């Protein structure tokens, strides 16, 4: 009823500068209303924490500020479960969904999957029992498998498969840092973890038990080059080690063992053709 | 009231051939009834997706077809939670269980463990908070520990321990492929994953952080032989790597570090006696 | 109304010696009352399974005996969920908590996190969706992240971060063995597992995908020394491998790659400064 996107941004930015003095008791009506509207827009996918523009990933720090203010301005309250009881300050996404709205929005939520309000879930996606945190964006035709986690602000592309127990790391702070990004058509194998704003580019295949943050060496065995923070598009990636200079030990790394071209970006068939 | 096992099989097989034209709106009564009865039989353990015959694992593709048809013929509906709401087409196993039936069937379900209808849980097993998917068979005296997953169609033997965070991969497609099988008396260490129809034979001990699918080399260090798709009975298996030819890197594998005889198949004591 | 700590200990110890003959039907009133009071004291943090004295970890076997007797003396009962139903003998911690008590005790429980009664959660801690088992102690200012597990009897120190999917192994048996201990100010990276009474000392930083039980070699690369069962205070630990004598394969280990002094014990900054 009051604010468009630039207004929201300014209201959020101004409130964030003085956040030290904001409490759930004293937060003003305009700030609260603006924070509420931003969360609603994140929830619907109308706004998103990061987005790819001119084919590059841009991060909207102000949307992270809004999420952080939502924590500041809300008190924890008792949350009635059935067999369990909870105590938290972030509402759940589907509290007001009925059959018509679930049918309209076009995704499936398999119990006991849970999603916080402020996260967008696109049509044709399936949430097996899993967790999707505030600020996340999960695009169309994606599978989030059992005990997987989509962290705060994470951007999951279309036709992605997050296998069982896969975690995509949240990034609220630092404000300037891009969230963790899985681009379109990626497969992430079971028990893998991609964190700290690492970008896995389109059409990549990551096997089981692969852990990649900003400190993880991503070894291109064909060239000997080492990547950090980015899995180039079409990469097939498995766990490995690199030897020490003394030869007495080796340390964990990811290894790019195959590269698939744009015009072709079968999971088991790719992994078969190794060595 | 109508169909025995051969009839069910034919009804399922015939419906499956024409599945492209079957919707939740138009599915006929006989098909629906047959699909419902098959799910009930899978749920009770009276039928099972794979079984070991003349001491060999045989897969009943038609039971997978029935599970797949159950998805086709049922609409998603709103599923009321307490603090969360869901939207899915597969009912939960214990909806109609009372105290008498839980006492009769003889297992424990520790909250918030969840099991889909169409999965069999045998007596003396304990489900810590975990997930058991449709088509799975979990035999007697087994522990499914916290955040473990028993995937679709998976066969878990008697006296098995699935440690915390262990995933047993589902296999619905391809139809012909055996599901993931853990034979009797196996220990699977925390955070391990066994997928894609790999068979772990009786009395095996798999340590923590071991990931085995069809592409995973299982290195027998004693002989230099490489296994795929099968952990031979009595094997003690840990994570390792194999070196590249250039010596510049190594890649992930499982390693058989000890072999225990039939007449003897202590977990910490076995792992202690390494090197 | 009846028993202090030494009385409780004797009542528990005496009952434990004759536990073979104790059933939920025949358990006497005094034993039941004593077991109930011990669980209450564990729940409130007034008693704890292990504690550090004269700066050393001492284990109270009798508290484990009380937990074990609580299992013996209680029948499983139906536990009403909403969309799911359960069947177990251990009550949940927050059944009788209201807003005032949650505010007093000072922690947050994010749905669907679950905690069994008999576990202590200190103020300023956050339980993301996770599991905390009976007998555990979780001290102040700690984060238990999504799909993490704090096992039975585990002692988690102040200002600890248990990242996503981290498991801290339970230790009820053997009775004499210390539980798994994470000392104050430790960071444990995603998907890591610390089990079997391993002690991670103060100010340690464990990266992602690190698995440490009593059989895991902890390799100090600076000295060539191998540790078992203990991560010395201030250690920075990553996954690695050690080569075999034949050079044909390597096996999993943890590697201490950096050591931080007492007077200084940034996570990404530490891991950056490797090699």
Curated annotation (Swiss-Prot), chains A, B, C:
PROSITE patterns according to UniProt: HEXAPEP_TRANSFERASES
EC top class named in words: transferase
SUPFAM superfamilies named among the record's database cross-references: Trimeric LpxA-like enzymes
Annotated GO MF terms: 2,3,4,5-tetrahydropyridine-2,6-dicarboxylate N-succinyltransferase activity; nucleotidyltransferase activity
Record InterPro entries: DapD_Trfase_Hexpep_rpt_fam, Hexapep, Hexapep_transf_CS, THP_succinylTrfase_dom1, THP_succinylTrfase_N_sf, Trimer_LpxA-like_sf
Biological process according to GO: diaminopimelate biosynthetic process; lysine biosynthetic process via diaminopimelate
One Pfam family hit: THDPS_N_2
Gene3D superfamilies: Hexapeptide repeat proteins, Tetrahydrodipicolinate-N-succinyltransferase, N-terminal domain
Keywords recorded for this protein, A-Z: Acyltransferase, Amino-acid biosynthesis, Cytoplasm, Diaminopimelate biosynthesis, Lysine biosynthesis, Repeat, Transferase
Subcellular localization, as worded in the UniProt entry: Cytoplasm
Residue positions binding substrate: 108, 145
Catalytic activities: (S)-2,3,4,5-tetrahydrodipicolinate + succinyl-CoA + H2O = (S)-2-succinylamino-6-oxoheptanedioate + CoA
Known pathway: Amino-acid biosynthesis; L-lysine biosynthesis via DAP pathway; LL-2,6-diaminopimelate from (S)-tetrahydrodipicolinate (succinylase route): step 1/3
EC number in record: 2.3.1.117
GO cellular component, one term: cytoplasm
Protein origin, superkingdom: Bacteria
Main location (coarse class): cytoplasm
Assembly: Homotrimer.
Family from the record: Belongs to the transferase hexapeptide repeat family.
Protein name listed in UniProt: 2,3,4,5-tetrahydropyridine-2,6-dicarboxylate N-succinyltransferase
Name of the encoding gene: dapD
């Amino acid at each position: 009823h009051h604010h468009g996107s630039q207004q929201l941004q300014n209201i959020i930015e101004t409130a964030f500068e003085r956040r030290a003095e904001i409490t759930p008791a004293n937060a003003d009506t305009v700030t609260r209303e603006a924070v509420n509207q931003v969360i609603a827009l994140l929830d619907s996918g109308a706004l998103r924490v990061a987005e790819k523009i001119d084919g590059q990933w841009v991060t909207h720090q102000w949307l992270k500020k809004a999420v952080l203010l939502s924590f500041r301005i809300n008190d924890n309250q008792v949350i009635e479960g059935a067999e369990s009881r909870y105590f938290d300050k972030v509402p759940m996404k589907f509290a007001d969904y009925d059959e018509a709205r679930f049918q309209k929005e076009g995704f499936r939520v398999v119990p006991p999957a849970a999603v916080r309000q402020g996260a967008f879930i696109a049509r044709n996606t399936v949430l097996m029992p899993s967790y999707v945190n505030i600020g996340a964006y999960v695009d169309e035709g994606t599978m989030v498998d059992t005990w997987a986690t989509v962290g705060s602000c994470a951007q999951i592309g279309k036709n992605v498969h997050l296998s069982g127990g896969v975690g995509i790391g949240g990034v609220l702070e630092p404000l300037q840092a891009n969230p963790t990004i899985i681009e379109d058509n990626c497969f992430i194998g079971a028990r893998s973890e991609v964190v700290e704003g690492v970008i896995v580019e389109e059409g990549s295949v990551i096997s089981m038990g692969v852990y990649i943050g900003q400190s993880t060496r991503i070894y291109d065995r064909e060239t000997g080059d080492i990547h950090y923070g980015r899995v180039p598009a079409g990469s097939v990636v498995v766990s490995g080690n690199l030897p020490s200079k003394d030869g007495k030990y080796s340390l964990y790394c990811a290894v790019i063992v195959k590269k698939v071209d744009a015009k072709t970006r079968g999971i088991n068939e790719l992994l078969r053709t190794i060595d």
